[PDB]
Design a protein around this nucleic acid. Structure first.
Lengths: 121, 217, 348, 107, 121, 55
RNA sequence: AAUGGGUAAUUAUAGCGAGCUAGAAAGCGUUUCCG
RNA sequence: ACGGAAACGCUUUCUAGCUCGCUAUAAUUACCCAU
């Protein structure tokens, strides 16, 4: 669960929780997780953030229901994105989307993940 | 006497126009330049300030001799309609541009439209080393139609020079169809079309017949 | 008045891809007949939750087979007797050259309006005009690309003047070249080609897993170009000679050092609508070759020569308009160069 | 219930200098579109009038009709106006006058 | 932390604490930080300063939580803003924002940052 | 309690003067519209009152 | 070689951030009771 | 048998006029990875 007063510190502590390169002593403490894979996950939710300030919530149960499919598909391949889906509890947080405010809070949680990933590394 | 003339018109788009607002709390990796929208309905609108601005600066290249250093210098066939603040007799000019909201929101349905503002990605590309810098900007979609609602205002000073006014307004719109109605129009974006123009009188018993055949010439 | 207009008739050769940012991933299309159907996958999941196969589908996605054709989305619908589509209707006919039939992966979308029709944005055509203009003039193709700070690869964006710049009268040459969009053409002209990298110092052509859905060749697309001032107005009827000079300096290097059967002749004015083409049609080429050959010490290294030639496979097609039926490629097995197009331009 | 966040939208505008084409921006608060305001317009009836009451009702109704064709407050040549008046009805809040004919007169 | 009697002085000293261009003396002592980078951040602190006077602090806090997201992201990419959030400490002034007067004090602190960034040009 | 800084508001206001149509501003101070004032009014009963108190 | 796969960047950049007019103007400064 | 009594700080007055959210900007580049 993430409320409006914790979803940024949860994202910071989750990116710090994330697995790093134990090898490659040139630039250590780098992640096994690139910007492209995480911004794929942000691009999953960017359109649901944009077309939810405009649309009613009941016209969006289709693509929010498909986000369940799409995050576990993106976590299927490239098993170190699976680590981020497990660490930053995203599949847990997708089940709690029940209104416009919770949907937009999850989209801003994804932007918080991408923010603390660009900041850390 | 006193009269009010209502130039009703429709505004079709040929390319999608982008009359900008700013949303400061836009998302990371989402719409970086959103359009001005109506806060209740969330449809895009054409604000009348943008119409009055484009029409004035395009007629200023036609009806001004000795080109204007400021909009306080329009050659008083243009300052009558649009107003000079620094002129005692033409401030609060003749025209009243209303915001054109949208008319065909039902007609964009059954053509197949998810949202009334599309998003276009637009890519700055650096022409050394080919590195990129993408955009995502909103754009009011192609076959939209807006209710243009200009209002002209007739007093006793108006009476002998209304047609000289209406030959400007009708030539404003034709000047604006040949240009872009705000936006980023150097690349498409707002080639626009004023259709089925109609001047009807709404107060004060003024003949609108000899000037309504001039709007369809 | 001073607004003088131009028609740019753009004969697409050699398939053309633009845009849309996103991509249909793998497992998001069915290959049932000799055509690819691209559902609205939310509605797909809706109807497939109604048939109570949600956990079955989520176990289908993460599970890979040693064969590819039983991992695609047609294998889910045949291992569950799912028969109807009725989804978000969009399908494009396959060419026979995407290849094991339909085991392609992650096609890239083409840019589309809200009504769902493809079109070429005039933003994307006023970059292909602008490389021609920035390459043929000696004043812009000079010792450009001020680096001056940190990383080399920046460009002097302020060399071609565009800002308002108070006091000084507003010129802004590319404000005065207004390129409009196309009419939204049909989905039947989209063909889904794949990328092919033809190397130099290695005779092979290697297929990459890129699947740009692209405009079929021999489609004519009309653009309008309004010019307002005289200086920018004079650079547009001269786009013929400048497009030919850009191709002459672009066939000089990087379209040398390759066999001539890969490249094809053009016979109208050559332009490169952008995707695939890569780094030499996108770029002004000398400062490009220096600072852009620098930018890759990776696994996917842009190797020792200027570049790797970008080709596609697409169905063969002849024009039969000149004195002779022009075969439109100079080889067998249907290699086109990606992003090539021709145009003729005409005032009013 | 219509789901709007604020009651004032903010209108981002600019001006282009005629020469040099520089833009100078503006931010204008304005009320949102389908907002509604209770308008009340107390009219006094003294013993002196006896014809001026029904003469002045015509003038008030005409002055409310001219606010719908002109603007209100605003920056009205650039939008910002277009007031509609709905549910026009008058009633004697200090009694002994018949507003039946006037509420008929307000269509 | 920001008291009500020092935050403009903290903002002035922090704008003077921004390290400058030692490279080419075509108008030297310019900043690596550009006006648009800093002004995008004031663009969203000054639309909460407007709404705080109208709305309530318990009705704004999704925006106030997203301020930390956007300041962390903009100080990710393009390190000359990371310089500013270090010198003019924002992420520590953002965690201490529990009151509406403290919110407005932070918004006017950000305005003092931009005022002295323009003044020392 | 309900957040109000000053017990008075200041209303800005003008006088658009028919043509020339030049405005002429004005700042007038008002009290605010939930102010409540403690009103008293002493009426008196006497010998002359007692027939006319109800009226 | 075949087979199975895509992967890495950039997510806006540089600016403008309000300008000029008006800044209160007409009236009433005591009247009656009183000598 | 209160230097008192009677007496609205009140009337009239649009925060208004002028002002394009604009300027430039191909969703593109690289060509591989694993068994």
């Amino acid at each position: 669960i993430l409320t409006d007063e914790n979803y940024v510190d949860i994202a910071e502590k989750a990116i710090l929780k994330l697995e790093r390169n134990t090898r490659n002593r040139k630039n250590p403490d780098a992640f096994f997780l690139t910007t492209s894979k995480l911004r794929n996950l942000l691009s999953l939710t960017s359109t649901l953030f944009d077309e939810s300030k405009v649309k009613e919530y009941d016209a969006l149960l289709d693509r929010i229901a498909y986000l369940r499919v799409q995050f576990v598909y993106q976590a299927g391949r490239e098993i170190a994105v699976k680590d981020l889906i497990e660490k930053a509890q995203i599949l847990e947080a997708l089940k709690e989307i029940k209104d416009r405010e919770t949907l937009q809070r999850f989209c801003r949680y994804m932007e918080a993940l991408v923010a603390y990933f660009k900041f850390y590394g | 006497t006193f009269a009010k003339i209502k130039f009703s018109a429709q505004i079709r788009l040929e390319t999608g126009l982008h009359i900008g607002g700013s949303d400061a709390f836009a998302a990371i990796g989402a719409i970086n330049s959103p359009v001005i929208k109506d806060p209740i309905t969330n449809l895009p609108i054409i604000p009348g300030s943008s119409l009055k601005g484009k029409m004035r600066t395009l007629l200023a290249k036609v009806y001004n001799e000795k080109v204007a250093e400021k909009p306080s210098d329009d050659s008083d066939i243009l300052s009558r309609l649009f107003g000079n603040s620094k002129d005692k007799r033409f401030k609060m000019g003749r025209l009243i541009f209303r915001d054109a909201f949208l008319s065909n929101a039902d007609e964009l349905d059954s053509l197949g439209v998810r949202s009334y503002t599309e998003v276009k990605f637009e890519n700055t590309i650096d022409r050394i080393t080919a590195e990129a810098n993408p955009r995502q900007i909103e754009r009011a979609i192609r076959n939209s139609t807006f209710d243009f609602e200009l209002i002209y205002e007739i007093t006793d000073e108006n009476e002998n020079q209304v047609e000289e006014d209406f030959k400007v307004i009708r030539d404003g719109l034709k000047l604006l169809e040949l240009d872009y109605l705000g936006g980023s129009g150097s690349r498409g974006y707002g080639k626009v079309a004023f259709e089925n123009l109609k001047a009807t009188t709404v107060f004060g018993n003024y003949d609108v017949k000899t000037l309504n055949e001039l709007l369809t010439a | 008045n001073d607004y003088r207009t131009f028609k740019l008739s753009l004969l697409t050769l050699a398939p053309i891809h633009i845009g849309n940012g996103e991509k249909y991933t793998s497992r998001e299309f069915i290959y049932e007949n000799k055509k690819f159907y691209f559902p609205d996958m939310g509605k797909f999941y809706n109807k497939m939750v109604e048939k109570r196969l949600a956990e079955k589908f989520e176990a289908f996605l993460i599970q890979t087979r040693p064969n590819a054709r039983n991992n695609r989305l047609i294998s889910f619908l045949n291992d569950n007797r799912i028969a109807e589509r009725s989804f978000g209707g969009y399908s494009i006919s396959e060419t026979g050259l995407e290849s094991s039939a339909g085991a392609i992966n992650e096609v890239n979308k083409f840019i589309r309006d809200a009504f769902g029709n493809p079109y070429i944005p005039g933003s994307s055509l006023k970059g292909a005009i602008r490389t021609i203009l920035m390459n043929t003039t000696p004043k812009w193709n000079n010792e450009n690309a001020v680096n001056d700070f940190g990383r080399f690869p920046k460009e002097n964006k302020n060399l071609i003047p565009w800002g308002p710049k108070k006091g000084k009268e507003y010129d802004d040459l590319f404000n005065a070249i207004r390129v409009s969009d196309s009419k939204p053409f049909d989905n039947k002209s989209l063909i889904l080609v794949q990328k092919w990298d033809y190397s130099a110092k290695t005779n092979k052509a290697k297929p990459l897993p890129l699947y740009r859905e692209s405009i079929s060749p021999l489609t004519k697309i009309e653009f309008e170009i309004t010019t307002t001032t005289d200086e920018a107005g004079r650079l547009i009827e001269e786009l013929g000679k400048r497009a030919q000079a850009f191709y002459k300096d672009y066939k000089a290097f990087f379209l040398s050092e390759f066999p001539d059967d890969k490249i094809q002749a053009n016979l109208q004015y050559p332009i490169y609508l952008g995707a695939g083409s890569g780094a030499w049609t996108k770029t002004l080429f000398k400062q490009a070759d220096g600072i852009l050959q620098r930018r890759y010490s990776r696994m996917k290294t842009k190797m020792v020569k200027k570049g790797v030639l970008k080709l596609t496979k697409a169905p063969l097609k002849t024009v039969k308009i000149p004195s002779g039926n022009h075969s439109l490629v100079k080889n067998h097995e249907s290699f086109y160069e990606m992003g090539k197009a021709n145009f003729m331009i005409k005032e009013i």
